[PDB]
Each structure stands twice: as C-alpha cells, then as structure tokens.
Design a protein around this ligand. Sequence first.
Ligand SMILES: COc1cn(-c2ccc(N3CCOC3=O)cc2F)nc(-c2ccnn2-c2ccccc2)c1=O
Ligand SMILES: [Mg+2]
Ligand SMILES: [Zn+2]
Length: 315
Amino acid sequence: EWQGLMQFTLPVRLCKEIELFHFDIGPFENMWPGIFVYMVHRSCGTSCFELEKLCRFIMSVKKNYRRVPYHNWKHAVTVAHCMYAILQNNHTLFTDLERKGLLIACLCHDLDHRGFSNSYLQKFDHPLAALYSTSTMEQHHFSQTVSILQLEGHNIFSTLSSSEYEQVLEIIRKAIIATDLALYFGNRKQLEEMYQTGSLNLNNQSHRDRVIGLMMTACDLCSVTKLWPVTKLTANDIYAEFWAEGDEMKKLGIQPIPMMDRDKKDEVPQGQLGFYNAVAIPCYTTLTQILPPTEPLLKACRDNLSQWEKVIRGE
Ligand SMILES: COc1cn(-c2ccc(N3CCOC3=O)cc2F)nc(-c2ccnn2-c2ccccc2)c1=O
Ligand SMILES: [Mg+2]
Ligand SMILES: [Zn+2]
C-alpha cells in the first residue's frame, strides 16, 4: 500500500487550488494520502522525513480511522489541509519543528475515534473514561499517535535530536488536547483579552501554545468554511454521528439531548445558526485578529452563516 503512495504525483490542475482555504478534498478520495505527502513536502521540504517511513506512517494512520459517519479519514485530511493553508499563509511565524508537528497532529487528531463524545464515555464509565478522566478521546488520540510512531519503520522523527524529539511530541500532545472543544472557550477568551490589552507576545511559549490551540480549533471546525454545497453535506455527516450517539442512549430507554435526537431534526438549521454565532464566528474572528492572512476562513464562515439564516427563513 505505502509503496504506491511513494510514486504519487499530485495532478498539476490542483497545484493552485490546493492553496486556497476553501479547497474541498471531497472529490479526490484515492488521492488523500498523496495530498498529505504533497502538503508535507511543500511546507516542511522533501528532506524533512525519510519518504518510506512517512508513507508507512500515513497508511497506518489511515488504517486507524474507523468507518464512522464524520470522525473518519476524510475528516483527518480535511483538518490537515486547513492547517497547511494557515502555515503557507503565515510563512515567517512558525518554526520548522512546529510546522512538522502541527501537520502530523492534524492528521492524527481524531485517531481511532469511536463516534462518541467524552460526555457519553464518562456517563457510562467506559474504560477510556476510567483511564482518561478529562479530554477523554483526545488523550486516546495522542496515545494512538505515539503507538503508531513506535511501530517498526514508522518513526518519522527518528532523525531528530533526542531533545527535538521530546519537543515535537509535546507540540503534538498540546495540539491534539486543544481539539477538545470544551477547552476552546477558555482559550479563546484568554487570547481575546491578551489581544485587547496588547500583552500577547509570540516570544512567550505559553502564548504560542494558546495560538496553536486556537489554530487547531479553527482547522478542526473548517467544514464551516467551505463553499455552501460542501458545508451543507458535511453537516449531514456531523448529525449522522450525533444521531447515532443518541440512538445508543435510546437503546437503554434514555432520551438524549435534542442535538443528538434524530426526532428533533427540524431544529438543525437553528442549531447551526446558534453554533456559528456561539462558536465558529468567535473562533475565526479571534484567529483573524492574531493572524490576518487567515481572514478568508472568517469570510467563508460568514457566508455559510447567512445560508443557514435563509434556510431558517425558508428562502
Ligand atoms: C450544533 O452544531 C454543532 C455542534 N458542535 C459541537 C461539538 C462538540 C461540542 N463539545 C464537545 C465537548 O465540549 C463541547 O462543547 C460542542 C459543539 F457545539 N460541533 C459542530 C461542528 C461543526 C464542525 N465541526 N463540528 C464538530 C466538532 C466536534 C465534534 C463534532 C462536530 C456543530 O456543527
Ligand atoms: Mg476530536
Ligand atoms: Zn476533529
């Protein structure tokens, strides 16, 4: 499998499109692993990883995303591509180690996702929630990332100094934990206050950590920043997964919250309008304030918000 990946060349017709924030990987399934190699090569250089190890690694990552409706291999590559666009548009800001780490973190950030929220696992005392009390799935995702790195022939970071290795692993760990949306609200609030008071300082590692955290949220949510027909279809996948979780609760006779209740699907457009206003807009707004070149994400997010309004108003 990984051998043919090494041979892959991205078709020229996509070399410019892939650079756009709103690029949709959807029509190109067979190319997804090749697209990740492409993005790594443009962003970190072709000398960054031993090609063979990189290819084994990517195919093992792919193998460890499950066949769930949303948190799947497609989602992984979509999030990685958004991070590619951020990094490419902010060429001076991030170190080589950060760029490598963040691309890998994005590809790995939902590894072995089961289609269940942290809340669900915690409610029912799943072994994963007994192991990881908070940010439950996110600690599992990082754990899975480390397990793949430690497979024979998969250590893409083998040629880093011992110190650079622990550094990148921490970058990756913080970045994946940051994708727990419960942590986003506090992070964005801290960042906003630091901005408005002019105390945000990118020489400060804890500030850098917070910015990266916000970048991770922005990439994770980036389905809301695609062209409307793409965003609309992705909303279908998201609720399919939400509703499957609710179905699991109904199997114990338990009524789930309305977001997870397929009998409540008439509320979806209002649910989206709420989510965009409460979560997505503030996210891309703060991101754009800190990193002005990411503005196309906010613009695209606003466009989709006005689409949901039209749906609600029956236009
Ligand atoms: C109501 O519509 C939506 C609600 N959520 C949502 C999800 C989790 C939490 N959680 C988990 C822990 O703490 C939280 O607050 C709160 C949320 F609002 N996400 C999306 C969305 C749009 C794009 N990606 N995702 C997405 C993000 C994560 C998981 C699934 C989907 C969405 O469209
Ligand atoms: Mg996740
Ligand atoms: Zn995700």
